[PDB]
Design a protein around this motif. Structure first.
Motif: not given
Ligand SMILES: CCCCCCCCCCCCCCCCCC(=O)OC[C@H](CO[C@@H]1O[C@H](CO[C@H]2O[C@H](CO)[C@H](O)[C@H](O)[C@H]2O)[C@H](O)[C@H](O)[C@H]1O)OC(=O)CCCCCCCCCCCCCCCCC
Ligand code: CLA
Ligand code: CLA
Ligand code: CLA
Ligand code: CLA
Ligand code: CLA
Ligand SMILES: CC1=C(/C=C/C(C)=C/C=C/C(C)=C/C=C/C=C(C)/C=C/C=C(C)/C=C/C2=C(C)CCCC2(C)C)C(C)(C)CCC1
Ligand SMILES: CC1=C(/C=C/C(C)=C/C=C/C(C)=C/C=C/C=C(C)/C=C/C=C(C)/C=C/C2=C(C)CCCC2(C)C)C(C)(C)CCC1
Ligand SMILES: CC1=C(/C=C/C(C)=C/C=C/C(C)=C/C=C/C=C(C)/C=C/C=C(C)/C=C/C2=C(C)CCCC2(C)C)C(C)(C)CCC1
Ligand SMILES: CC1=C(/C=C/C(C)=C/C=C/C(C)=C/C=C/C=C(C)/C=C/C=C(C)/C=C/C2=C(C)CCCC2(C)C)C(C)(C)CCC1
Ligand SMILES: CCCCCCCCCCCCO[C@@H]1O[C@H](CO)[C@@H](O[C@H]2O[C@H](CO)[C@@H](O)[C@H](O)[C@H]2O)[C@H](O)[C@H]1O
Ligand SMILES: CCCCCCCS[C@@H]1O[C@H](CO)[C@@H](O)[C@H](O)[C@H]1O
Ligand SMILES: CCCCCCCS[C@@H]1O[C@H](CO)[C@@H](O)[C@H](O)[C@H]1O
Ligand code: OEX
Ligand SMILES: [Cl-]
Ligand SMILES: [Cl-]
Ligand SMILES: [Fe+2]
Ligand SMILES: [Mg+2]
Lengths: 81, 37, 35, 36, 342, 29, 62, 334, 451
Positions: E117-119, E121, E22-23, E133, E114, E26-27
């Motif tokens: 948020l990736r890190q 997720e 999901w991130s 993160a 993003g 955005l990323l």
């Protein structure tokens, strides 16, 4: 080990090269022409070596008006010709 | 300049000093050929 | 100043001599494995 | 599945990188950006 | 799975070469645009109208001198949206007004969100604690303080850093001559966390490599390791003794050691960010008042602190007319500070 | 720069040519 | 002596490029060691002769 | 055994709380001398005529400095590279005016720190360790040599050595920029990559190991108690860490080999900092940063400034102001 | 593929040349091929410099490092360093280039075709690193070769036309050395000079008689020592002090080359006798002094009394005292008062710079040289923009002195690193722990706690 074909398979295969021995050079030549035709200057609004200054003009065409800066640049640009 | 009789060889002479660099790069071509074993 | 210089010369010579003779005193043998 | 050896692909590819970067260095001395 | 949300979740989270998540929504577009905007502007776009500078390969700049430069000072803190009141949807004019600057800065800011948020997720899916993160908050604090807060405290985006190698060098020298930023104790703590982090990076890598267990016959020792092995690859006990005797102290707890390696550079970057928030307001550590009172009354009193302000005064007077073109500075030769001969 | 470019072209190919010939011939690489 | 000199030098250049490829290929080649060893010897004596020919003709052209 | 033999045994003992060793026999006295002279000068030394123009600069706390402005000031430009030990001076008062303590400190410190590096090799050999921690320390040590010895040699004077002080350090940086355009030098750029990347990989490694520590404690205890000094079992899951990081970027961008990982951690900052040191040490002989001043010219020949030219203007400000009473002729040639 | 993978050799590809340690034939190949690379570069670089060379511009305006080396030997040059004949430069370039093909031939043969080890084949050429006798014997051969090389320099200087002498009375010129310095008090006295300012250790050598005489000594010392090492085996205290292994010997040589690298750096930076400024450009100290000379000349022409002109600091604007009283140039160049050069020495008297000689005897050739040297100071950018760092583009100049000093400092430094790398590896491998700590014989576990 996530599934996709290994890169080293792809880039040593005859077929990869049949496709790319045409796509790679075609892209490179299109980039070349984007410059050599002059098109790059007009898309981005970048001065040519003869378009930074009018012949006798003293100063730089600095934008000084937030909401009519666009018009300023337009006037700055006719004042070359 | 080189004596005039050798002038035709000017372009070759321009490139020779770099050949040592090529030998280093050659070690890597060779290793890539033997799979860096 | 003369006395000071002679003093320092002596001090330095003394320590340099420890370093040199020290490393001459079977240094390779001074390890935990093969001597 | 391979047919062109990876070491050739690397060598040709590497040489291509050297050429284009060489060209870029050439251009530091000629035309725009050359100071002349 | 269930409904469309859960089927989307499934696909987003497939185990593939480049993980999406999901991130990723955005990323990926934000990072792509920030990077492409940078390569686009540095390759093709001028800064003639905003700064009076050439800034692209197209104009003759090299990799060191190209930049995507900030908008003119008269733009203020305009978002400078392509469709906004300044460019009014004209892509060419938007480029010439510095629209690529706020384009890159803002997509870049969303992209970093993003990324972090990736890190989070990926940590949650793999079942690890999210310290990576957390460490990444330091890059975020730096980016946000320097590229957003700093110019927002100043007159305009013009004074943010421009995206380029030489342009950033110019930003450093401006901060020295105008803010005396080297004197600032939040910058000094930044420097300590950066150099101390680089120190810990080097010393911990060297110590592990030099206290390795002989776990193979090879004289090249990298093969003598297995990711799955139960055992430590190097001797903590021997590393502890070595440093205890060399330096006087040593780590004994590997967990503490690695948390400290997060702590030092992360904390140093956060400290530098706070000093930059102060510089947004010109709230500088510029002077020591006691030094100035003494030096004003005693023309024989000199320190390295007084010497450096003389350098700052030179930097301001010599660089300002070209660096701040909207000010229309004209400084007659006779007023420029100069020492003897030079 | 055509003369110099041709020279560096054949000097440059000589190294990898040697490797190629040997590989083809299953030589002692 | 120029025709002679210039041929002798271009010949030296050319034989050099040939030896540069051929000596390492011969030396690491499984097969034709007999046919190679002979050519390497000939190429070499020839290479040396050309150098001396260039060296001597140098003074009739400089 | 004889006295000498027992002495050697003591000097080289693996059992001393602080290792001594033969390098230590030189290191101990030289570091002690530099430390003591430094502390006393930093507190109490009078002003020093750094630039040889009878314009003494106050470095010490008692003469009006604070921790940030204080320094031990470099020796006088009149001295140059001449060796100025205490006994070369007519008096301690002259020695102090001319910046004698600076030479004493830096020569003892450089010798002592070089011995610190030898001593690191020495102990590693006594302990049956591999030997290259001392090679990692060569990077900061090279950098200290560059700023306290190589640069002064190139420029012909210890008065251009880095001052031993916080503000003095910034003075050296700013003047170095005016004179060498260091920011535009690729070796300093590699040093930046070395230290920013060292910080980055330090945080990265800390966070990846910390993130995969094996549960061994309760929520009330520090997780640090989950590791016991000297245990055999690794304390985190590297396969888990690699699993995370390989997905953050892509699989082959992540190390699953701890030995390769730790080698990279050593190498990246050490190599970058060696280039930092070599940047200073070669700008010592005035091979300077890239100069693109007026590199971009329009069709008529007007100069079109770039960010390089704006750098140049800041450099000019530093150049014309620095050592404002020391130049009589138009070029600053050292 | 004998030893040519990690499994067999124990060394990865990136340490592949360590696979050669005990393969004397292939290792001899590597060495000879390498010597061919060095000879190759010397020949190709010289031809390149010659092809580019415009004889009427100074060498130092032309990015030349090798032609200046040849000229200093007295080949190709006349009074003032004027180039009179490029042919000697040509000969040097050609002979090295031709020679490198031979060496390259030998290298490729040994490396690829010859016996991989030499010991079975020959006992004169085979060797074991641990054979102390064979090691000092090979060392002795090389010492004799080096000794003969040093004497070739003497032969050039004394019997084959001389050397370029920047100090020649009446002006720089090639000069035959007939009275070389033999007195060991002078020759070895240089070795005991302080390396600090005004002394300069061996870098201070300031006349060709000392240079020639020193190589007479060095040639004799090397030949004698080489004989010595052929005829002897190392003494007991030697045997106890050193590691005896190929990697250890590499390391001793790495340290020595590092040291020599540093020495060369300072030589080219300061010395203007064996690096004549006519060919290499002025030294940093020289150009700074030349500037003060230039403005003293100018302003005194305008009527200034330069002896009595007090500058802004209270020190003389043109002329001041050194800390021991000698009259020296003022301004920042006060640091450079140890400088000595042929264009300046005529103005120097027993008390330093002489005011009466200054007022009356400055010749136009001194003014010209001082202006040339001031304007060729060894300062410039990495892209070869000559000048201070703030200079605008125009002058394409970086002094050969800066190129030679910087390059050699980089090399000498990385050679120190390689010395530490290899000396510490050699120690560890000799004691048997270079691959890591034995998990069941971890030395620190057998030691008492520190506390
Ligand atoms: C194993 C042994 C180790 C033992 C270590 C401890 C022993 C001390 C050694 C000295 C170390 C530094 C001394 C200062 C060096 C210096 O100012 O050297 C300069 C001198 C030359 O001095 C100059 O020499 C000149 C000679 O020129 C004179 O003579 C010329 C003749 O043509 C010209 O006329 C010229 O104009 C004229 O001035 C003048 O005297 C100058 O005033 C004088 O400054 O060089 C020299 O002596 C050459 C030798 C110096 C080499 C430099 C070493 C640098 C070390 C790098 C370490 C990096 C470490 C990394 C660790 C990780
Ligand atoms: C997730 C991806 C993402 C994100 C977060 C952003 C974020 C941003 N973009 Mg970028 N962009 C993207 C993908 C993204 N972009 C892609 C794929 C492209 C290629 C097309 C672009 C091309 C692009 C350009 C060319 C520009 C931007 C700009 C911007 C900025 C202003 C955007 C804005 O005001 O939208 C406002 C819109 C929204 C916030 C959408 C809200 C959705 C709501 C909830 C519903 C709306 C329904 C509505 C009622 C119905 C219609 C309205 C009706 C009244 C008429 C901002 C930094 C500008 C900028 O950088 O200027 C300096 C700019 O000029 N982007
Ligand atoms: C100065 C550079 C140099 C030299 C002289 C050598 C020398 C050698 N190396 Mg090392 N090596 C180097 C750099 C060098 N290496 C570098 C930079 C790396 C890292 C990439 C390596 C990594 C490495 C590994 C991993 C190994 C070696 C091995 C060897 C030896 C055997 C080579 C072989 O089997 O060839 C086989 C290759 C060929 C048959 C291809 C052709 C080779 C020839 C020499 C090309 C010559 C070209 C030249 C232009 C011809 C001129 C001819 C003219 C004069 C007539 C040889 C003595 C091997 C070893 O130790 O064996 C015991 C070994 O395993 N090297
Ligand atoms: C002692 C070594 C040395 C020195 C002092 C010089 C000096 C010079 N050269 Mg020569 N040259 C050399 C070796 C050297 N060269 C070699 C090995 C070659 C073969 C490639 C040449 C071939 C050559 C040509 C073809 C030309 C010169 C020219 C020049 C001049 C301009 C140089 C320049 O612009 O650099 C630009 C600077 C660089 C390219 C940067 C080099 C930096 C390197 C990559 C970093 C090294 C770091 C270290 C060694 C790596 C360690 C890694 C670590 C992890 C361990 C200058 C006088 C020019 C001239 O004017 O001729 C008349 C010219 O046209 N040279
Ligand atoms: C230091 C370099 C060196 C060393 C120690 C050796 C040693 C060896 N060589 Mg190799 N070789 C070399 C360089 C070297 N060679 C070069 C440069 C070439 C190309 C010419 C060769 C080509 C070569 C071949 C083709 C063969 C050898 C063979 C041999 C072996 C027998 C040699 C002999 O018995 O001669 C005894 C002595 C003589 C024949 C008289 C020597 C006359 C010399 C040339 C006089 C010049 C002296 C002077 C000091 C030279 C200075 C050179 C310097 C300026 C560069 C022995 C292992 C043989 C071997 O491998 O057998 C299986 C073999 O077949 N060599
Ligand atoms: C490359 C040249 C070279 C090399 C590698 C060697 C190597 C060797 N030599 Mg030999 N030697 C040489 C040239 C060389 N030699 C020459 C030219 C001569 C004639 C003068 C000799 C005459 C000679 C004798 C008479 C002896 C050796 C001995 C030895 C052995 C140990 C030497 C030692 O411990 O030194 C280390 C140096 C010391 C232990 C001296 C004390 C250390 C001081 C404090 C160092 C001071 C220097 C300092 C760094 C300052 C530098 C400059 C300074 C001069 C101002 C070793 C096999 C010994 C032996 O075993 O013979 C078989 C021995 O007795 N050599
Ligand atoms: C902005 C914009 C946009 C976007 C765009 C994009 C997205 C783009 C992209 C682009 C891109 C994506 C580009 C790229 C480029 C690239 C390049 C240009 C590269 C180069 C490279 C090089 C040159 C290399 C180098 C090197 C290195 C790095 C290292 C090694 C060595 C060498 C040197 C080789 C849009 C439309 C949305 C809208 C509006 C605006
Ligand atoms: C003097 C002379 C001569 C000589 C010559 C020679 C001696 C040559 C050599 C040559 C050589 C010696 C060459 C070589 C080349 C090489 C190369 C061209 C390489 C490249 C490489 C690369 C590109 C790489 C890549 C890679 C890999 C492989 C893997 C990893 C990755 C990478 C990418 C890195 C002649 C005959 C002309 C004659 C006249 C004079
Ligand atoms: C072992 C080995 C290696 C190495 C190799 C080497 C290092 C080699 C060397 C080689 C060499 C070192 C070669 C050389 C050659 C040379 C030549 C071939 C020459 C020729 C010459 C000529 C031809 C000349 C001509 C001329 C004249 C006479 C005059 C002027 C002009 C001219 C210049 C044209 C490597 C790394 C690959 C790796 C594997 C193993
Ligand atoms: C040519 C010339 C000259 C002369 C020169 C000479 C005469 C020289 C000599 C030189 C010499 C005569 C040198 C020597 C050196 C030595 C050394 C460099 C040493 C080293 C040592 C070592 C390294 C040791 C080590 C150790 C120790 C210390 C302890 C125990 C252990 C061991 C064994 C490890 C002159 C200047 C006049 C002039 C110019 C030219
Ligand atoms: C200014 C520099 C001084 C120059 C000195 C020149 C040195 C060259 C001559 C070397 C003679 C010394 O010889 C060396 O002396 C030391 C100290 O007595 C000896 O004695 C040592 O032996 C053993 C060896 O394991 C040690 O454990 C022990 O502590 C020590 O007594 C060495 O075994 C001997 O080899
Ligand atoms: C962009 C995603 C955010 C919106 C999430 C709200 C889910 S809404 C939810 O969706 C289910 C399918 O997943 C349906 O079965 C269900 O009827 C519906 O109420
Ligand atoms: C190995 C190199 C062989 C060539 C030696 C050349 C001798 S050198 C020759 O000698 C003359 C005096 O005899 C000098 O006058 C002249 O300057 C010099 O060029
Ligand atoms: O002293 Mn310290 O700083 Ca190196 O330059 Mn010149 O001198 Mn001074 O001016 Mn700029
Ligand atoms: Cl200053
Ligand atoms: Cl001055
Ligand atoms: Fe770790
Ligand atoms: Mg161009």
């Amino acid at each position: 080990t996530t599934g996709e074909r290994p890169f080293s398979d792809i880039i040593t295969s005859v077929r990869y090269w049949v496709i790319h021995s045409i796509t790679i050079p075609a892209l490179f030549i299109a980039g070349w022409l984007f410059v050599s035709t002059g098109l790059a200057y007009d898309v981005f609004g970048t001065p040519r070596p003869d378009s930074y200054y009018a012949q006798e003009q003293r100063s730089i065409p600095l934008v000084t008006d937030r909401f009519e800066a666009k018009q300023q640049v337009e006037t700055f640009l006719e004042q070359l010709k | 300049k080189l004596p005039e009789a050798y002038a035709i060889f000017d372009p070759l002479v321009d490139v020779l000093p770099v050949i040592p660099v090529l030998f280093l790069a050659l070690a890597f071509v060779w290793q890539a050929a033997v799979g860096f074993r | 100043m003369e006395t000071l210089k002679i003093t320092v010369y002596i001090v330095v010579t003394f320590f340099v001599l420890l370093f040199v003779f020290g490393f001459l005193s079977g240094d390779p043998a001074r390890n935990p494995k093969r001597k | 599945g391979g047919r062109i050896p990876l070491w050739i692909v690397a060598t040709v590819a590497g040489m291509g990188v050297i050429v284009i970067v060489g060209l870029f260095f050439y251009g530091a001395y000629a035309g725009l950006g050359s100071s002349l | 799975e269930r409904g469309w949300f859960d089927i989307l979740d499934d696909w987003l989270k497939r185990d593939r070469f480049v993980f999406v998540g999901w991130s990723g929504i955005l990323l990926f577009p934000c990072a792509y645009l920030a990077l492409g905007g940078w390569l686009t502007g540095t390759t093709f776009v001028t800064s003639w109208y905003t700064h009076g500078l050439a800034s692209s390969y197209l104009e003759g700049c090299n990799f060191l001198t190209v930049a995507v430069s900030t908008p003119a000072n008269s733009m203020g803190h305009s978002l400078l949206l392509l469709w906004g009141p300044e460019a009014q949807g004209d892509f060419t004019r938007w480029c010439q007004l510095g629209g690529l600057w706020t384009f890159i800065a803002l997509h870049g800011a969303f992209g970093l969100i993003g990324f972090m948020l990736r890190q989070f997720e990926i940590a949650r899916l793999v079942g690890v604690r999210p310290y990576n993160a957390i460490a990444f908050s330091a890059p975020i604090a730096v980016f946000v303080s320097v590229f957003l807060i700093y110019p927002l405290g100043q007159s305009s985006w013009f004074f943010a850093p421009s995206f380029g190698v030489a342009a950033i060098f110019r930003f450093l020298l401006f901060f020295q001559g105008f803010h005396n930023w080297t004197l600032n104790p939040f910058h000094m703590m930044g420097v300590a966390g950066v150099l101390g982090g680089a120190l810990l990076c080097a010393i911990h890598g060297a110590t592990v490599e030099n206290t390795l267990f002989q776990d193979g016959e090879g004289a090249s020792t990298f093969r003598a390791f297995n990711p799955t092995q139960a055992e430590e690859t190097y001797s903590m006990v021997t590393a502890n003794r070595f440093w205890s005797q060399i330096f006087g102290i040593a780590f004994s707890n590997k967990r503490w050691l690695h948390f400290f390696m997060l702590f030092v550079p992360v904390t140093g970057l956060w400290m530098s960010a706070i000093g930059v928030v102060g510089l947004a307001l010109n709230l500088r550590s510029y002077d020591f008042i006691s030094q100035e009172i003494r030096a004003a009354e005693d023309p024989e009193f000199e320190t390295f602190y007084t010497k450096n302000l003389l350098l700052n005064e030179g930097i301001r007077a010599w660089m300002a007319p070209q660096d701040q073109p909207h000010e229309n500075f004209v400084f007659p030769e006779e007023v420029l500070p100069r020492g003897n001969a030079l | 720069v055509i003369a110099q470019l041709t020279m560096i072209a054949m000097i440059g190919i000589a190294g990898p040519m040697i490797i190629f010939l040997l590989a083809v011939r299953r030589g002692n690489l | 002596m120029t025709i002679l000199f210039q041929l002798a030098l271009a010949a030296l250049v050319i034989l050099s490029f040939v030896m540069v490829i051929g000596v390492p290929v011969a030396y690491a080649s499984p097969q034709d060691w007999d046919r190679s060893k002979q050519l390497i010897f000939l190429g070499s004596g020839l290479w040396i002769a050309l150098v001396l020919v260039v060296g001597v003709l140098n003074f009739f052209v400089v | 055994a004889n006295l000498w033999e027992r002495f050697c045994n003591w000097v080289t003992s693996t059992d001393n709380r602080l290792y001594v060793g033969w390098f230590g026999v030189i290191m101990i006295p030289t570091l002690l001398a530099a430390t003591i002279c430094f502390v006393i000068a930093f507190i109490a030394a009078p002003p020093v005529d750094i630039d040889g123009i009878r314009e003494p600069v106050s470095g010490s706390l008692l003469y009006g400095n604070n921790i940030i402005t204080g320094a031990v000031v470099p020796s006088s430009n009149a001295i140059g590279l001449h060796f100025y030990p205490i006994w070369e001076a007519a008096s301690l008062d002259e020695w102090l005016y001319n910046g004698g303590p600076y030479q004493l400190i830096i020569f003892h410190f450089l010798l002592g720190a070089s011995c610190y590096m030898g001593r690191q090799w020495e102990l590693s050999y006594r302990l049956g360790m591999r030997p290259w921690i001392c090679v990692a320390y060569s990077a900061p040590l090279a950098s200290a040599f560059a700023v306290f010895l190589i640069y002064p040699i190139g420029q012909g004077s210890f008065s251009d050595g880095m001052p031993l002080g916080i503000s003095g350090t910034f003075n050296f940086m700013i003047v170095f920029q005016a004179e060498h355009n260091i920011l535009m030098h690729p070796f300093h750029q590699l040093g930046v990559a070395g230290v920013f990347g060292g910080a980055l990989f330090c945080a990265m490694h800390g966070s990846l190991v910390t993130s995969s520590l094996i549960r061994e404690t309760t929520e009330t205890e520090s997780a640090n108690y989950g590791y016991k000094f000297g245990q055999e079992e690794e304390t985190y899951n590297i396969v888990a860490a690699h699993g995370y990081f390989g997905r953050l970027i892509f699989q082959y961008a992540s190390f699953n080999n701890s030995r390769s990982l730790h080698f990279f951690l050593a190498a990246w900052p050490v190599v970058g900092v060696w280039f930092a040191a070599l940047g200073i040490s070669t700008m010592a002989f005035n091979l300077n940063g890239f100069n693109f001043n007026h590199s971009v010219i329009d069709a008529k020949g007007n100069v079109i400034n770039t960010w390089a030219d704006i750098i140049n203007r800041a450099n000019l400000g530093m150049e014309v102001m620095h050592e404002r009473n020391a130049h009589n002729f138009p070029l600053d040639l050292a | 593929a004998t030893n040519r993978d990690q499994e067999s050799s124990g060394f990865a590809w990136w340490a592949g040349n360590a696979r050669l340690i005990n393969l004397s034939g292939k290792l001899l190949g590597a060495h000879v091929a390498h010597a061919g690379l060095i000879v190759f570069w010397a020949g190709a670089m010289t031809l390149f410099e010659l092809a580019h060379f415009i004889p009427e511009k100074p060498m130092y305006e032309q990015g030349l490092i090798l032609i200046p080396h040849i000229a200093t030997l007295g080949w190709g040059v006349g009074p003032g360093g004027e180039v009179v004949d490029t042919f000697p430069f040509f000969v040097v370039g050609v002979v090295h280039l031709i020679s490198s093909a031979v060496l390259g031939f030998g290298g490729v043969y040994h490396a690829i075709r010859g016996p991989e080890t030499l010991e079975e084949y020959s006992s004169f050429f085979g060797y074991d690193w641990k054979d102390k006798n064979k090691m000092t014997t090979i060392l002795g051969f090389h010492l004799i070769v080096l000794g003969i090389g040093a004497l070739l320099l003497v032969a050039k200087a004394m019997f084959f036309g001389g050397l370029y002498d920047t100090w020649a009375p009446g002006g720089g010129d090639v000069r035959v050395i007939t009275n070389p310095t033999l007195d060991p008090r002078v020759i070895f006295g240089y070795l005991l000079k302080s390396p600090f300012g005004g002394e300069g250790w061996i870098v201070s050598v300031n006349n060709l008689e000392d240079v020639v005489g020193g190589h007479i000594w060095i040639g004799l010392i090397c030949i004698a020592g080489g004989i010595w090492h052929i005829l002897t085996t190392p003494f007991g205290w030697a045997r106890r002090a050193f590691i005896w292994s190929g990697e250890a010997y590499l390391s001793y040589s790495l340290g020595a080359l590092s040291m020599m690298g540093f020495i060369a750096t300072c030589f080219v930076w300061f010395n203007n006798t064996v690096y004549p400024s006519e060919f290499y450009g002025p030294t940093g100290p020289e150009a700074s002094q030349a500037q003060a000379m230039t403005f003293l000349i100018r302003d005194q022409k305008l009527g200034a009394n330069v002896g009595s002109a007090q500058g802004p600091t209270g020190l003389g604007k043109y002329l001041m005292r050194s800390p021991t009283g000698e009259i020296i140039f003022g301004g920042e160049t006060m640091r450079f008062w140890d400088f000595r050069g042929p264009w300046l020495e005529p103005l120097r008297g027993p008390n330093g710079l002489d005011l009466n000689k200054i007022k009356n005897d400055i010749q136009p050739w001194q003014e010209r040289r001082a202006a040339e040297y001031m304007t060729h100071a060894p300062l410039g950018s990495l892209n070869s923009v000559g000048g201070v760092a703030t200079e605008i583009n125009s002058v394409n100049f970086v002094s050969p002195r800066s190129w030679l000093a910087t390059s050699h400092f980089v090399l000498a430094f990385f050679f120190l690193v390689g010395h530490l790398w290899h000396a510490g590896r050699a120690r560890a491998a000799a004691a048997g722990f270079e691959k890591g700590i034995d998990r069941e014989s971890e030395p620190v576990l057998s030691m008492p706690s520190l506390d």
